[PDB]
Amino acid sequence: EMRLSAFFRNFILQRKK
Numbered sequence: 592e593m594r595l596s597a598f599f600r601n602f603i604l605q606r607k608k
Contacts, residue, residue: 598604 595604
């Protein structure tokens with residue numbers, strides 16, 4: 592089921608962002 596799964600990917604995830 593992954594780890595990050597539906598992490599913040601629905602937005603971004605990069606710290607740069």
